[PDB]
Amino acid sequence: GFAPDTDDLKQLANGVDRYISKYELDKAFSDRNTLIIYLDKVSHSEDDCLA
Amino acid sequence: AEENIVSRSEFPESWLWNVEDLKEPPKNGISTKLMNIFLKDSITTWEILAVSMSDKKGICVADPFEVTVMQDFFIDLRLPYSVVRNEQVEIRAVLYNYRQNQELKVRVELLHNPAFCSLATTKRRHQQTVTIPPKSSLSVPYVIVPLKTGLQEVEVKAAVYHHFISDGVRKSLKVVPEGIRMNKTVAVRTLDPERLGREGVQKEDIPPADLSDQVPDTESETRILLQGTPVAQMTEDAVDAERLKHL
């Protein structure tokens, strides 16, 4: 019964180091069971937090 | 719902390992053979190969015959090779649809395993209904806790509303005891009579293994390996014949 928001994913795709597929965008609240995120780099010095 | 409907269980990686004899009278050197075989429950492509051993012509392998097996709506349950006891694990139940123009609203369930700890219980069972637009793929994540070591069973069944189309998949996975599989060499010995023995006959004692930090409720495996060491020696090829060309 849960699904991630669309505008947040749009903002993430707008920003660097974050990529969400276009096919995920036109995948509205009816079906968003699983999500996929790709990170360009992972920071080892500190913790990279995304919400 | 999922009680009078059978599932798919036979998923071998190689079958039809059979032999056949061509005994029909020849028709310009070609014999026709009509044989009934049953394709496996797996939904994939089968590379059927044939090798003929004739007593007059010779051996011959046929160009690989590819058989494509298809369904307009099915389920694939993807599992790792092995799991570890008393841990949280997540598995993928993909639903594939290849009907070009039809919206699907399907009910999916998995039967409980007494050797597994999921939300599935003898009374409280999974009851979820999902929606698939035509020509797309889905994915259901499932949470499980392995309890006892062994080859266990995973059941999944799916039924589409307003159509007489159903599917089921049974898969087998290994459950491994927690910890690192290690191999503590108990003993290595050289066996040699009349050198370390007492007048031919010998007797050597192997103490029990330490096993101080063994995980309880597990069974171990003691392998005794025997081997013969070649003592190949001298007396190789003698003098060459070149020196004998004068006698």
Place this chain on the structure above:
Amino acid sequence: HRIHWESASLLRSEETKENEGFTVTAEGKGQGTLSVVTMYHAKAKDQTC
């Protein structure tokens, strides 16, 4: 078991479930090798992430 030169260099494996002392008798003429290894699970469970 019998070890012959022609049939040597073969993995003769004897499997045991119980941890107990063993007694081997090496007779005849020649040499040989023997290895006893217990494969098991140990409670050295560290963090795996």
Place this chain on the structure above:
Amino acid sequence: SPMYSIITPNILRLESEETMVLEAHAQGDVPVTVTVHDFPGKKVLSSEKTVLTPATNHMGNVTFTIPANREFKKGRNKFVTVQATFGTQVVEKVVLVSLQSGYLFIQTDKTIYTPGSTVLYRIFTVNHKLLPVGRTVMVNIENPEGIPVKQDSLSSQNQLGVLPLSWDIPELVNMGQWKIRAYYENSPQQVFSTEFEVKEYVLPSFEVIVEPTEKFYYIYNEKGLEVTITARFLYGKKVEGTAFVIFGIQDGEQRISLPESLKRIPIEDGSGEVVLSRKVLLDGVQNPRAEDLVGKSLYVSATVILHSGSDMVQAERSGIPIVTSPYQIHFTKTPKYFKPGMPFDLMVFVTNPDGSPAYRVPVAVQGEDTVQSLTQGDGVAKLSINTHPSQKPLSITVRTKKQELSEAEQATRTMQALPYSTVGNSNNYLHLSVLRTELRPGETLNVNFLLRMDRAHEAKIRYYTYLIMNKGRLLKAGRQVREPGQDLVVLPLSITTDFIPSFRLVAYYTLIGASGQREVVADSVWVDVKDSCVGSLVVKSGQSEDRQPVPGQQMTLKIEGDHGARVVLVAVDKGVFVLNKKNKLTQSKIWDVVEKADIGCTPGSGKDYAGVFSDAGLTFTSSSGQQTAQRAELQCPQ
């Protein structure tokens, strides 16, 4: 004076059929007795008798079968003395016997296994005619370390060549490349191998292939290298997902990766379009010159993740060559000796630099002009060059005159050719040149017998005797008269199914060299046939292709084959081919095994007639004292 000679294969195998040829140059009914007795010493194996026929010009269509002996056994290898006597004179020669009594084709149901399953395998025991035979076999199963874990010994008596065995994989076992080594009981050095994986895996749900638009790579590309992604399900459908692509360089026993060329692409409906730029490749290494990359190949590693994040398919197209010229020339099937005066045809094999044959590509010569050809499906072109009649060696290279391309992209390679040592400076040669076409069973090949003698004694060559050597045996023999005034004759040979994969057509005839003295002029030419089955085994469906098969349904398979043949079936998923497509049984593998075990490696036309027959794999001996050399190994040097 009556003249006699022996024709025998260079190597004969135990428990088989061998054929020798006798010729009389002595009309009249004369019997011949051939005796095979072991060597060294004089201990008898076999003896045969046959009377010649004057009306047939005395061909030797005489055969023998070597006994299935048991005391032949360690130490150095063994020879056999073969003797012939046509009543009044004795001729004997030494021949080599082979422990390679046949071939063992070990075929497993899969390529990769799990701990806790069963390896199923079939040993196909054939002989050098690729025919079922009954022998005893010793089988070993070796662990990845190299020590057997199981051994067995079976017999193939009245089993029609199929030896089905099985093995159980323990649940507590070592992972890696497991081996099966089977050899005939009589031949401990005839080890046949089959390596299969043992791994902890799970079936992939789709096959991904990474294919280049241009299958090679060029240094001076101003656009880059384009590779496309075809990720299709194993049942032939289209995917929707993402992929990660990285590159590298295949140096000597190492792999260098380029994290800069680590790209991510959306697989849009089973399709991708990845472009590797030249700047990234240049920055990957620290070489000031790009030309130093010639001689090394790239590899593309792709990994496609579905939108469900379920499967994990890592596919690699290793070996993308970087070459200045996209065409490479070979001299594999071309002889290393040239014929002065006689036109010396060259078998030109021009291919993509990774072995795949080219097509519609010509060949050019530095000095010769207006001469060009075209490449057929197999990948062989043709040319004709007249040679210097003197003893000057010929060294030539093959150039390409392909259009829409630069003149600096034409490959070259110096080839060394040696003159033939004609006995007595007679300038008499032989050329069994054949027109290069697609040879199929049931067709007719117009084999040409090119001739170049002198008018002084050209009319004294009454007939030509031709011999066919296939799989190291005298397949057939024949004669063709040569009346005076003819310089070319055509033999419309009906090529049957017994000429696969190839046949050495050697020809011989007698001669007198300038004073009452016996000589033999002979030559052979390599001829290859399109590699289809000797028999006709095909598999299909007895239905009418109405609709797709459905899981759990039956289909009535149709198998077409010979009569009296034993056909074995294996149905295996293509997911194992996804995980490991290595070591698969194919008819091309069988023919390559035969060719590697064939008695000939050089095309022919050696330094002398003895060298000619050594290349052709023959032993000729006569009362005049002429004899050839001998060879003791099994495979050709280098």
